Design a protein around this nucleic acid. Structure first.
Lengths: 157, 48, 138, 180, 98, 79, 154, 67, 41
RNA sequence: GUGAUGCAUGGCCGUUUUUAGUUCGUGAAUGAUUUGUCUGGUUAAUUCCGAUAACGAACGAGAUCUUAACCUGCUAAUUAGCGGCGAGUACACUGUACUUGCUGCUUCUUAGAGGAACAUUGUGUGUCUAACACAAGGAAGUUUAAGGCAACAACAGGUCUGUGAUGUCCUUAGAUGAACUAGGCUGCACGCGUGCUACACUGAUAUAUAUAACGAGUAAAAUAUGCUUGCAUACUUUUCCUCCGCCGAAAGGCGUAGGUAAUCUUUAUCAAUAUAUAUCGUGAUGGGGAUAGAUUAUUGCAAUUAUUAAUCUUGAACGAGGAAUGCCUAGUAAGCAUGAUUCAUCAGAUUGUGCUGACUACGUCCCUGCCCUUUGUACACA
């Protein structure tokens, strides 16, 4: 019998709950939906309350926690997202990087729109961490879904 | 102990587990620190 | 017969209804005289000089005025009564003199027929003011 | 038709220099019973001059310390002041007003070499100088600011040395005699 | 019969769902209700540490309500809603008589 | 003191056999557990000791634990 | 001076048509003559408002406060002690700390309303929870309004 | 204020397709621009049309660089 | 400082100029002859 | 582990930096490199026009949307109404303020939706190109204004005291974990900020009408019994804002209406600058309040370090301001309040909102600080 305005914060925070649940757990596959294997999570959440950019982002952490070459790993991912159909791509791996000095490099292709409400509604980003031998290496990735139509797309037969 | 249901001790942020900079707006019960990165998923759409 | 008209200008929105009668005008339970400012009373009086009390002597214009600034009440009510008299001239009483009625209002000004859309803004970050910053030190 | 404070309609004015006329801008569109209309100036170069000189004082004499930001009382003081002008003197308050604003502006000032003043600043410094005469004639002067006004506008409009504005005008002109 | 949500398109589609069944069934149906939207907004500082310029961000949630009434059978309307409602939308039921 | 009863340990030992998934919370000051008429303070020490024995695993989270019971777990604590 | 020409059709059927502050002044005038009420001997030692910080210095503050409260009754047939306190709110200066708006003193208005109830000009009732004029109060204040209207019209 | 090359080239690409359908009327030339184009922002949908009209007021007076 | 006194065109300001009096007693003398500030007759 | 290391790191953020800048494919000109990316014109902007060993691209800029506005006599009325008559309480005479109740009706109180603003039309400047002007309709002509997103590269900027984000080093029974008693950041020659309160009659003071918006709001009392006020066990929900009717000058206290909320505070209305007349009529003055002891009630178990708070006593500086120095062009500065956060109690802090709608600029490179071109460098930690 709580207020609906209070209930909105409630289901927002609960949704963020299950979000961090599935982000903490999901590393062996992609996303197969959410329910409104399966048995453990269904029981856990119940007793608790009683071609994807994200997939490629997690594939990045999976490719580099094991010590595979950073450069070749990034190149493999920038092939993966085009062959899946990503319009462009971007990836940053910043941190200790084998040297006592932080360093960051970029691997960009395509447009990579970066400012605006139509920018945010189309660009797809993700960030991750990778605990390493002598520090942690931050990952950022960006994938664009090809164009609802873009504001700057004009064409007449 | 000296527990009571009053003051800054009876509640705290539910992820950092700290009593500093906790916001209870609409009983959200979170700290500004972790909240600023959960803002989008929860639904807080930075608009204007 | 009966027409209900509205006036939106600044905070205050005036509502009036032009009805059949002899010239009974009512502002809440108040008349056009006890609002306080005799300065704005004559501002509302200006149309009655523009048109005439003789024509007002054959129709009733009730008014409800509620909320908003003192200036906005009067500025909304003048537009509301102008729209009401225009609607009555269009619908029931007479059209040819309505043609000249619009002309004599517009000759005095366009402000009566339609007001302004000036309004305040969301104050910006940086200090107490919208466009003023906290004093800086070096 | 209209009546300023239910009294005045300023149907006769002085010629002055005929140039300050466009700046003072007394006309039917600017006719009003009391100042402090919703007039706006933040679009162009004229409507600041379009605004009636009566408003140009009710908004300009206002500043002194705490007394800042009180304008309804500025309309109050000008309304009373106009009473005392036509009472202590036999001429129209607004006419001697126009006389004062006309003959209370600096005809030139060097300001980096002397330079003539546009009619806008001619009216501007006249208003400013009479209002800053009002403030120091209301501070430590025994008499109240209302009678101070009744003294200063006549002092400036009849060329009497008692007005602060005319002394400051003489000082401001005197710089020409040294530079130009 | 009132609806609750935050993104207007959800209420728009689930509200277009409403009157078609009433027109089909020729029921005694009351008119719609179009309430002003509620806006929930909070302000929070950026910059986890105190260093640098103090900067803040403002948030916004738009909350959308409408109310309907129908002199139709409670079970049939409940099912004809549950068939085509989204869990992201909340519904309450009430009846009329005339 | 804080002596842990054998009967308390056994009651908790069946409370997780009957289900297979448990949440115990880091905070031990709550007077009661939603599905346990037990004082909680005596249960996370033992669950953590069991996790230190490589029989039950915890993926961990913020203000939650979310332990899981392994294939080799119903056998060792049965008796 | 306070009169201006009226070319529009009036009613003059009640009190809201006539002036307010001068009407309550004339009501205080009739109230001195008829003196159905007391001063009272209790208001003289307590200031009207918390933030007033001054004595009223009128020998008629209570007398015009009752008049104003009656005018507020006439306007709003549903008001309470909180309503009158808010209607009488005044500034308060806290010395080195900033000014703040704070309400009036409850007991003065409570005594005024109890005196009005004794006078019978107003009454209470569950429905219409605020103060509601009696029909006798309506007729008395309406004939008072008509008398006030005529004495200034002619 | 000027105008951006995106809208300039979007204004140039049209006209050449159905000049037999474009006519003198400003409102008609406005309407046909959205009728034929694909722009999703209405501010463009009239902003480019403004420049298109600005271009056709250069015809029957000299060379207009294209068409 | 104050030196004016009630002891001895009914305009308050003009009569105050003519007789060097306080404004309260100036309105007092105004009342004495005729029988915030007002518009004049 | 809020122990060291932010000069070992992640992420975030703050700065260069809200400017106009950055890069690539191919081509052309021992090399670093250059061109493209520009003499000029224009501009919010490498924004465009144009010239052009460059041609063609990508980012950045541009843009999108909310707030205000007009319509869509669309769409409709909850918690908004409009009526109409049902009886009137008092008047007019051949309708009215205050009331009860429903339904002919939705521009009105409103949002679902889109539309409308497009140098728009003509009279002008401009290589007649880019652009810029007047007048006008129109609510909307400075992109209708105001809000956010910030490329490349960098700082050895801040943070490992935010995190079970984290490397390395360092420590745990005489802890570097937790709890409990008391204390401190409120202590003070001073200095600098952010601010809070006067120097009055443009004001000091008492009465009241005409006042809006963003607003925000629900594992514990008490009673009974037993033992002898305290403990244990049982029953409603007090534990939000509050309206009302009472008590107390007040603070505050009592019992209840409403509401998880366009429904109750409250909204046919919540503050202040008001108002018109009234006391004063610039006399360190009655201005103004740095300053006191005496206390009364609330807040929390605890108010001493007078938390907060009602009254009486108080009477420093203050005559518009040292050298210096900050911010600021439209319903904005400023004045005035006020909402919200941190909240058991506490703005003198921070973030929003509204009222009064001020003096003047269709600008300049003088200071300061940026951007570009050329030029000189013995500078490159620049």
């Amino acid at each position: 019998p709580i207020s609906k305005k209070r209930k909105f914060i409630n289901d927002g925070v609960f949704q963020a709950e299950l979000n961090e649940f599935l982000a903490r757990i999901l590393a062996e596959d992609g996303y197969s939906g959410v329910e409104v294997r399966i048995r453990e999570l269904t029981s856990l959440v119940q007793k608790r309350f009683f071609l994807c950019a994200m997939a490629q982002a997690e594939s990045l952490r999976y490719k580099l926690l094991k010590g595979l070459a950073v450069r070749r790993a990034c190149y493999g991912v920038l092939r993966h997202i085009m062959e899946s159909g990503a319009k462009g791509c971007e990836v940053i791996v910043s941190g200790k990087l084998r040297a006592q000095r932080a360093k960051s490099m970029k691997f960009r292709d395509g447009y990579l729109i970066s400012t605006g409400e139509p920018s945010k509604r189309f660009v797809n980003t993700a960030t991750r961490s990778a605990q390493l031998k002598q520090g942690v290496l931050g990952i950022k990735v960006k994938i664009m879904l090809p164009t609802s139509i873009l504001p700057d797309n004009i064409s007449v037969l | 102990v000296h527990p009571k249901k009053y003051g800054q001790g009876s509640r705290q942020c539910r992820v950092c587990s700290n009593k500093h900079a906790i916001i209870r707006k609409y009983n959200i019960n979170i700290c500004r620190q972790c909240f600023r990165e959960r803002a989008d998923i929860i639904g807080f759409k930075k608009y204007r | 017969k009966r027409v209900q008209t509205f006036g939106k200008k600044k905070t205050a929105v005036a509502v009036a209804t032009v009805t059949n009668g002899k010239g009974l005008i009512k502002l809440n339970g108040k008349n056009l005289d006890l609002v306080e400012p005799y300065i704005l009373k004559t501002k509302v009086y200006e149309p009655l000089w523009l048109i005439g009390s003789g024509k007002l002597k054959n129709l009733d214009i009730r008014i409800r005025v509620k909320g908003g600034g003192q200036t906005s009440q009067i500025y909304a009510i003048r537009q509301a009564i102008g729209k009401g008299i225009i609607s009555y001239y269009q619908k029931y009483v007479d059209e040819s003199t309505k043609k000249e009625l619009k002309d004599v209002l517009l000759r005095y000004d366009r402000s009566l027929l339609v007001g302004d859309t000036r309004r305040c803004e969301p104050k910006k970050f940086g200090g107490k003011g919208a466009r003023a910053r906290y004093q800086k030190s070096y | 038709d209209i009546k300023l404070f239910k009294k005045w309609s300023y149907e006769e004015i002085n010629i002055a220099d005929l140039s300050l006329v466009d700046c003072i801008a007394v006309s039917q569109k600017a006719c009003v019973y009391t100042p402090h209309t919703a007039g706006r100036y933040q679009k162009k170069r004229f409507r600041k001059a379009l605004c009636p000189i009566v408003e140009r004082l009710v908004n300009s004499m206002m500043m002194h310390g705490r007394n800042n930001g009180k304008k309804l009382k500025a309309i109050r003081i000008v309304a009373y002041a106009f009473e005392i002008i036509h009472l202590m003197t036999g001429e129209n308050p607004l006419q001697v007003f126009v006389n004062a604003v006309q003959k209370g502006g600096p005809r030139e000032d060097s300001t980096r070499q002397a330079v003539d003043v546009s009619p806008l600043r001619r009216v501007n410094q006249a208003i400013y100088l009479i209002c800053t005469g009002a403030r120091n004639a209301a501070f430590r002067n025994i008499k109240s600011i209302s009678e101070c006004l009744a003294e200063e506008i006549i002092n400036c409009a009849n060329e009497s040395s008692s007005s602060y504005a005319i002394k400051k005008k003489d000082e401001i002109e005197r710089v020409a005699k040294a530079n130009r | 019969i009132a609806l609750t949500s935050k993104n207007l398109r959800a209420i728009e589609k689930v509200c277009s769902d409403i009157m078609k069944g009433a027109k089909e069934k020729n029921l005694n149906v009351s008119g719609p209700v179009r309430l002003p939207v509620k806006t929930l907004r909070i302000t929070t500082r950026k910059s986890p540490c105190g260093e640098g310029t103090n900067t803040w961000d403002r948030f916004e949630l738009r909350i959308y309500k409408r109310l309907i009434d129908l002199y139709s059978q409670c079970e049939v309307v409940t099912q004809m809603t549950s068939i085509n409602i989204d869990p992201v939308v909340e519904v309450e039921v009430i009846i009329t008589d005339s | 003191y804080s002596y842990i009863p054998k009967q308390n340990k056994k009651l908790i030992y069946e409370y997780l056999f009957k289900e297979g998934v448990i949440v115990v919370e880091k905070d031990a000051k709550i007077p009661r557990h939603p599905h346990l008429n037990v004082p909680n303070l005596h249960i996370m020490m033992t669950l953590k000791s069991l996790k230190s024995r490589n029989y039950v695993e915890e993926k961990y989270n913020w203000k939650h634990q979310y332990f899981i019971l392994n294939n080799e777990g119903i056998e060792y604590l049965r008796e | 001076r306070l009169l201006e020409p009226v070319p529009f059709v009036k009613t003059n059927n009640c009190i809201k048509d006539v002036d307010a502050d001068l009407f309550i002044r004339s009501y205080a005038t009739h109230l001195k003559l008829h003196n159905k009420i007391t001063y009272p001997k209790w208001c003289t030692f307590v200031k009207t408002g918390k933030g007033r910080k001054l004595a009223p210095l009128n020998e008629d503050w209570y007398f015009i406060r009752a008049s104003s409260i009656l005018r507020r009754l006439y306007l709003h047939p549903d008001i309470g002690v909180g309503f009158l306190r808010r209607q009488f709110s005044s500034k308060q200066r806290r010395g080195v700390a900033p000014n703040h708006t704070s309400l009036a003193s409850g007991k003065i208005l409570r005594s005024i309303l109890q005196q009005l109830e004794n006078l019978g000009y107003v009454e209470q009732n569950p429905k219409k929870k605020g103060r509601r004029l009696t029909t006798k109060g309506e007729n008395a204040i309406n004939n008072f309004a008509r008398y006030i209207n005529k004495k200034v019209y002619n | 204020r000027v105008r951006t090359k995106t809208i300039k080239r979007a204004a140039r690409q049209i006209v050449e397709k159905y000049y037999a359908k474009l006519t003198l009327d400003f409102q008609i030339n406005k309407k046909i621009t959205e009728e034929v184009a694909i722009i999703p922002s209405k501010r463009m949908k009239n902003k480019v049309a403004g420049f298109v009209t600005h271009l056709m007021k250069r015809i029957q007076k000299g060379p207009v660089r294209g068409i | 400082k104050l030196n004016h006194a009630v002891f001895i065109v009914i305009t308050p300001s003009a009569i105050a100029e003519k007789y060097k009096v306080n404004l309260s007693v100036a309105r007092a003398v105004i009342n004495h002859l005729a029988d915030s500030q007002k518009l004049y007759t």
